[PDB]
Design an enzyme around this catalytic site. Sequence first.
Site, mmCIF file in Angstrom:
data_model
loop_
_atom_site.group_PDB
_atom_site.id
_atom_site.type_symbol
_atom_site.label_atom_id
_atom_site.label_comp_id
_atom_site.label_asym_id
_atom_site.label_seq_id
_atom_site.Cartn_x
_atom_site.Cartn_y
_atom_site.Cartn_z
ATOM 1 N N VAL A 1 66.238 66.650 68.469
ATOM 2 C CA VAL A 1 67.647 66.540 68.094
ATOM 3 C C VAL A 1 67.756 66.547 66.556
ATOM 4 O O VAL A 1 68.638 67.200 66.006
ATOM 5 C CB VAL A 1 68.320 65.270 68.688
ATOM 6 C CG1 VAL A 1 69.730 65.049 68.093
ATOM 7 C CG2 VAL A 1 68.383 65.348 70.231
ATOM 8 N N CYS A 2 66.833 65.851 65.883
ATOM 9 C CA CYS A 2 66.854 65.715 64.398
ATOM 10 C C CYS A 2 67.187 66.993 63.573
ATOM 11 O O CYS A 2 68.137 66.968 62.763
ATOM 12 C CB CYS A 2 65.557 65.041 63.896
ATOM 13 S SG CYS A 2 65.201 63.421 64.698
ATOM 14 N N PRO A 3 66.416 68.097 63.738
ATOM 15 C CA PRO A 3 66.753 69.322 62.981
ATOM 16 C C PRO A 3 68.167 69.886 63.253
ATOM 17 O O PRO A 3 68.802 70.413 62.321
ATOM 18 C CB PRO A 3 65.676 70.329 63.420
ATOM 19 C CG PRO A 3 65.177 69.792 64.743
ATOM 20 C CD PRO A 3 65.239 68.310 64.604
ATOM 21 N N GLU B 1 70.866 68.178 63.710
ATOM 22 C CA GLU B 1 71.815 67.359 62.942
ATOM 23 C C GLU B 1 71.776 67.692 61.440
ATOM 24 O O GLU B 1 72.842 67.789 60.781
ATOM 25 C CB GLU B 1 71.552 65.861 63.178
ATOM 26 C CG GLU B 1 71.903 65.388 64.594
ATOM 27 C CD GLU B 1 71.627 63.903 64.820
ATOM 28 O OE1 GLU B 1 70.501 63.427 64.526
ATOM 29 O OE2 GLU B 1 72.543 63.204 65.294
ATOM 30 N N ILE B 2 70.565 67.852 60.903
ATOM 31 C CA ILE B 2 70.356 68.168 59.477
ATOM 32 C C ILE B 2 70.931 69.558 59.144
ATOM 33 O O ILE B 2 71.643 69.723 58.141
ATOM 34 C CB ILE B 2 68.859 68.054 59.082
ATOM 35 C CG1 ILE B 2 68.351 66.625 59.327
ATOM 36 C CG2 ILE B 2 68.657 68.459 57.616
ATOM 37 C CD1 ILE B 2 66.846 66.516 59.428
#
Lengths: 194, 195, 196, 194, 195, 194, 195, 195, 194, 196
Positions: free
Chosen positions: B50-52, B54-55
């Site tokens: 999920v992290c990438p 959002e960034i």
Amino acid sequence: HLSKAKISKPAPQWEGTAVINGEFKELKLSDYRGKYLVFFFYPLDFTFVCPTEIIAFSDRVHEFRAINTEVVACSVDSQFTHLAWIITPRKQGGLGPMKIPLLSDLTHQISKDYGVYLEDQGHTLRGLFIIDEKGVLRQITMNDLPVGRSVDETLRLVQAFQYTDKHGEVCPAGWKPGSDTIIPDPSGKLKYFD
Amino acid sequence: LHLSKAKISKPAPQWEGTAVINGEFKELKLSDYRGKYLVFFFYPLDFTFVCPTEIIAFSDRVHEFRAINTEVVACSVDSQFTHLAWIITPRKQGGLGPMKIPLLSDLTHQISKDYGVYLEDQGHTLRGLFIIDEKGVLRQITMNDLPVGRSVDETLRLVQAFQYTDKHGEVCPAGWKPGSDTIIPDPSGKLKYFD
Amino acid sequence: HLSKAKISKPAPQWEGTAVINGEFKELKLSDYRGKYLVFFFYPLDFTFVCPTEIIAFSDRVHEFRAINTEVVACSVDSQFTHLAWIITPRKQGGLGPMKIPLLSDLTHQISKDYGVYLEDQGHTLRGLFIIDEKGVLRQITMNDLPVGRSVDETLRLVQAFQYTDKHGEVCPAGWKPGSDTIIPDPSGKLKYFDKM
Amino acid sequence: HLSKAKISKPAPQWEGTAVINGEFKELKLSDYRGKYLVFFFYPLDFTFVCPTEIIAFSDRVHEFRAINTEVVACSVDSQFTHLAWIITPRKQGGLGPMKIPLLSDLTHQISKDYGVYLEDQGHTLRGLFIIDEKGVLRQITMNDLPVGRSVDETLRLVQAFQYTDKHGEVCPAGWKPGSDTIIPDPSGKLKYFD
Amino acid sequence: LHLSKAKISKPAPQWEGTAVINGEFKELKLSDYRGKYLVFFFYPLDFTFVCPTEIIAFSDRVHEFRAINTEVVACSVDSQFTHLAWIITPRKQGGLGPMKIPLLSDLTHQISKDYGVYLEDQGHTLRGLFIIDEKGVLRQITMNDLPVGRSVDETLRLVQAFQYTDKHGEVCPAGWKPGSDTIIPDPSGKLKYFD
Amino acid sequence: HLSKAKISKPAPQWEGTAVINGEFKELKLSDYRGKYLVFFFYPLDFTFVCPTEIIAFSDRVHEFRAINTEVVACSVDSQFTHLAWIITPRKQGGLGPMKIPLLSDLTHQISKDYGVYLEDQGHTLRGLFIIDEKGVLRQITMNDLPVGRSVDETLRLVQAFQYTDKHGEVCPAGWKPGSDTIIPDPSGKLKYFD
Amino acid sequence: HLSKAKISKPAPQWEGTAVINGEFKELKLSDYRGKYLVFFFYPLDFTFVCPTEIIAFSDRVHEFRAINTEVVACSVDSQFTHLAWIITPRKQGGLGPMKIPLLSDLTHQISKDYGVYLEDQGHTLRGLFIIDEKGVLRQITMNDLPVGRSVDETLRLVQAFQYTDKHGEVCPAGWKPGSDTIIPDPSGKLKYFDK
Amino acid sequence: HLSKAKISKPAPQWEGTAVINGEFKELKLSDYRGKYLVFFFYPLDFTFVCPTEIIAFSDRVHEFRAINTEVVACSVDSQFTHLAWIITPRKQGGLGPMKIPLLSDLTHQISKDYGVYLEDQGHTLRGLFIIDEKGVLRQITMNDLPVGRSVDETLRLVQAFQYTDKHGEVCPAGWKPGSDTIIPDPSGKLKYFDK
Amino acid sequence: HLSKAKISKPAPQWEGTAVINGEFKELKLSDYRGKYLVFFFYPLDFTFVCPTEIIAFSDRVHEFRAINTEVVACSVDSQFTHLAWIITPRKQGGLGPMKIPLLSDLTHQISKDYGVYLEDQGHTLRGLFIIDEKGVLRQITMNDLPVGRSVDETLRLVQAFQYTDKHGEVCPAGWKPGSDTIIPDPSGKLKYFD
Amino acid sequence: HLSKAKISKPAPQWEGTAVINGEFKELKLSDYRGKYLVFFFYPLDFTFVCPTEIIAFSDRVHEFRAINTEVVACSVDSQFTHLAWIITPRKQGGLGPMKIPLLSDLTHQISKDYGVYLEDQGHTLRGLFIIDEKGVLRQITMNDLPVGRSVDETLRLVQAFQYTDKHGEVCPAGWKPGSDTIIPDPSGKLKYFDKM
């Protein structure tokens, strides 16, 4: 800042008197096991942003009930004040008849347990909590006094947690029903990223 | 018992660290942003799922925030060397590509603990986002469990609302967007909205 | 049981927001220096005994003001709830227009300082306090929830304290204006006791 | 200020020597279980306001006894001083024969337990307590030294507490036997207010 | 004041964590190595400079240790996801390529603190290496400041010497290599070496 | 395990009596500022591995002196015992004449400060320390009792720390004078890795 | 057992209200500097042994005042009770008009300082103290409740202390004025023991 | 001031070596259960007032033994010094053969328990204690160093306590056998006060 | 075991009343600065071994005084008991006229400071201390109750300490005036040993 | 000054490695139960007064063994240094072959237990202790560094303690075998004092 509310841990237990369909009733967090729950605090009865939020959730409560989810509102005001507010017409800044329970936290113990109590003011800020069928805390949203919350964002988050619970894939930024998801594995992930 | 220095309506806790900015290592501080709104967010781990998303979502829309005197900064427990390796990795392999927002490293875990987002058992943060005004005061906190990403649309709405209430002295109802009705916070004045 | 309220010592200071003539105003205990004050707590807005007590003092406050004495009421409710209750008609259990201030104690600090807060309930019992012109506490009356207080008894007590302050003789059981008093001296007292 | 006396909780236990009908007898709070009790402290034997209060209650004790209520007085003075004051004639500031017990609190323990002891002076202030048949404390009245209490007000309060125990209606400001009462619920209350 | 649970001649502190082993995530424990010697070493940070040269040197020579009942495990504060990204990166870009030794992740910093190698101010370890025997007892500690790499040649010599003394009950002089003279540890017996 | 020895921090100060060229002399860590120092502890005079290590460093001390580096040995034995050992011939397990100082740590304070003291045995293990010209600690090597250290590895490490001090490039695994080095920058590094 | 009263050390200070010639007046120990003082406690006004001790001292106080000595009595009773007891005739167990002050100790502090308070009963035992001109405590006598003290023995003691203060010889068991004394020296004492 | 001695409570236990008929014997307070005891301390052997008090009690001990009462003396001196002082003739300031035991308190523990030890001097003051048949303390008398006590007053006190124990009337100031007593009742007392 | 007496450090200060030539006088340790002092404790006046030790030292005090040394004896007994024992004839276990001070330690403070007090018995054991002209403690000898000390050994030790103070050679086991001594260094020592 | 050594109490237990007839052996204080023991500390191996003291006791140990008494010496030096010193000839300041054990106290624990350790120096002073057959401590002698002890005085003390143990009379100042003793009783003592 101290609190008992921790994401991915069991939500702190609460018990109190609520107004439900015009009558006083005893209500407990444990009453909601088996369903998702949106549990939210608002500052004060007979104020400004607060009735807009309670009306918004009550008028749209059928949308949450269609997906096995209930809604409960809470402030530091007494049950007698809650009932007086319900009886006040919307045009005078009142609520009119309500389709969700209004819980009373006169002792301040529930507010303190959830980390939303303002010691200088004697009431809560705008704090909302999403709790799963097993009683586990999934999400925390907290706003300063002058800005209200969103029913649409709250629904999106409930739908996402239910989906990931069921399928074991995870939801990207901005996900809505129908959007692409990701397999959480260093190789499986490439099916999404490609 | 959960402990934190982050309190709404009080000054946001100071931070300092090394960030990756346009492919270079630079010292960055919360005080550098005085005079502007700041969206300051934590994400769990570089090279994950999920992290990438959002960034990338914030980087690809950062111009919308800059048009309203607002900046965006991202942070994890990963080192500055790992952040740069991740920026060099193509999007099709789960990397970021060139970035328009700083990536701050919190190797010591001190910043994460100060903001109340550190997960002791795991050694990294949950998904925590913070909105800070031009005087450095904390206005909003949003925290998600690991499997569910946040929303750029909602973050923008909240920045717009706080800027409106700061300027106009009226308050914003549930669901407010620019051009929607507002309330005068007085027992008599309120009736102009309610009636 | 802990408290800062002690008879013959200075009454604990307080500050808060009150409703006065329909508007929100900041009010402090020090504002009443130079006057007697009857300061009383009641449990909850929109309840039963509480409105009868506030109305009785409001309708009779002219009797107290004629003798350099003011009256102030207080509960844990917010100032917004106070105003809503004042707007509600007496026939529905409201107050109507009020001639005495209604103070808000949302933080519970004032209630705990006066020793009247009920921890299990989250509100006060029925506690009344009489404070003199110099700010010294002279009398404490506290009732359980179902039984109201008496304006007649409160008036008598203010009259008795004002009399002993001025004349330096002391007031027997049941004294009212016009009744006999006692010289507080081992031989002087026998003047009063001669009538027995 | 520290005390063990709390309204709506059991009254602190006490025991000591009292003068009853000219004799020294052991007396305890538990002795009064099953009746209401007016329990009051006064500063000092052989003083000024004190004998007027003790006389007023003794001369009217039949009024309390007719409604299942007893009366006990207490000061820090010894039992030997109590009897000397009883023997002293009313014209000389004495009590004459008494119909109520006079309890001695030489050690100060009872006064401290009830929150009425003055540390700088070595005696009590004017403190009165109304206790029910079950031993629960219902009312506290405390006066500074120069102003006496009222037997008429004390009788009214005992009457009001007995009424509300029996009927479950509540007593308005200034209630006396025969006056209007209130049903304590949001709709039932209108019988009174309208 | 420096604090640690690592003491020579005492049982080495227990550890458990997630490691990357043949490109897969696996739970790994110190107790898994009972019955064998273990070279257990910490390195500062993935995607840096001296670190990859040390990991490659041991991986490319691990067969020499396995021939004498000895295993090798590497550890940093980096996550398992970063370890795998680094393994996938080619050697010519400062990556590792396929690895023959496990890479253990210490995200919580607990393992590093237990071994006395954590640098509080930096949020990562120094260059610390530990030699542990078949019964789990600690025999050797080597620690270097950041700019200088360790030696595979010296590590092998030390393993060989400890195995010799365990088996023969004689002791090893300065510079000992297999086939070199040894000493009987007795005031009379010693003269067979000295005279 | 407690110690004052921390890599990259100033090495703990020491002072004591040493045997230097057959005489007793006062010696301090601060005497060595401006030079690198190899400071090493050994268990006990008149034992087994210990004399082999001291002889090895003494016979090869010219190699360290050619690169601005000195060597000092230390044990818990007294200075009188050190001198008796120096006078004992090599063939009897003695040292013969020495070219490096032997420091005495009778109080155990130096051993404890460097974290090498064995509380159960009353002497040190085999601990070696490399300290730079500014007094800062760069390297720690510690061996269990039955296995001796290496003069060759000690020289390699001294040469590497001096090189990185001077040039600001860093030294790979197994580096010796003449071997390739690395520029510690994400772009500069590729000149080595390519 | 706690107390501030110690023989050969300064007597503990006291202040309180006393009845003097039927009027209330403040009285302090330091008011008596320059004279000897007999300072005594009794249990309770309107009791049995107590009035007999107080009357005996009032009636004979001129015998003490002739040798620069005063007398003060004290109980835990109030000053209002003291005066009532003085107004009461001797035939009815009262005191009549008094020649010595009656000190009131309602707070119990004086009694606790002198070590005479009975915690279980809430009053004092029968304690008497002889204090010299410089304020130094010389003698302590304490009786259980049913046995009265002696004015005769008290007088003998004041006489003996006054003699030894002036002459510097010492007083044998049972000394009365005119009796033989001892020179306190190992040689000079033999004059007395000759007999 | 600390002590274990409290009137109307059990007298503190003691045990030690005493000189009895010129021999050393162990002696305890509990040996005297069933009889009254006069237990007294004196400063120092070979001094001045002390031999006069001890001699007066030994010579008159038959007067106490006639009414079921015993007498014991005690100082901080050793038992060897006690016997030396008894062997010394009365003309030279000694005691001669004795009829009452001399108890030794070398450790100072008995003296500290009874509250009579002088810390600056290392010996006791002149302290006397009357203890009843049940072991309860009834009376305390304490004198500064230069003034001796009275066998006559001591006898009067033992007589008074024995009377009140048996009859339950109380003894006025100065009572001797044959004197008037008081019935301790608010009505019965008036018989005495009639006179 | 607790004490303030430590060899090679200043002897603990003391002051008290002593019997000197039949008179009571104040005496202090500082009074002896500039001379050696033999300071000794004995259990009890009028006992058994004690008078033999005090007599032995008094009868030989001229031997110590001829070498700038004084002698003081001490027990827990009072000064009045000390004088009584001096007056008692030797045939009856007394002392007779004395030439050395007898110090009284009634409070036990001096005995506790020197580590010689027996808590269970209330007196000292047999403890002797040799103190130099500078006030520094040089020697401690302590015997259980049934065995007396030796004046001959005490004299030997005072002689040995004075010799080594003056010459800087050291005294072998059993040294007496006239015996061989040792130079305290590793080569100089051979003059003695060879 | 702290210590576990107290006269008339049990001597503190000790265990350590000693050199006995050239070999390393484990030795404990409890091994000597049933015998008197002279247990003494000396500062340092390869020094000056220390060897003279050890030699004197070694050369005369037969005198002690004839009277059921043993002798043990101890320093902070290792057992390997003890052996090196025993091997060194007397003419170079060595000991030569020894007839008494040399105990090693490398950890300093035994020294601190006996109250003889010098903190600033890292070794002991010259402290000697006499312990009886039951393990009870009877005598303590402690000297500053430059002055040696006396075998003659040590022998006299062991003889005196053995005599009082057996016969129950006590030994006057300077007692040697054959000298007069005292009955420890107030009249019995006068038998001894008659000769004065």
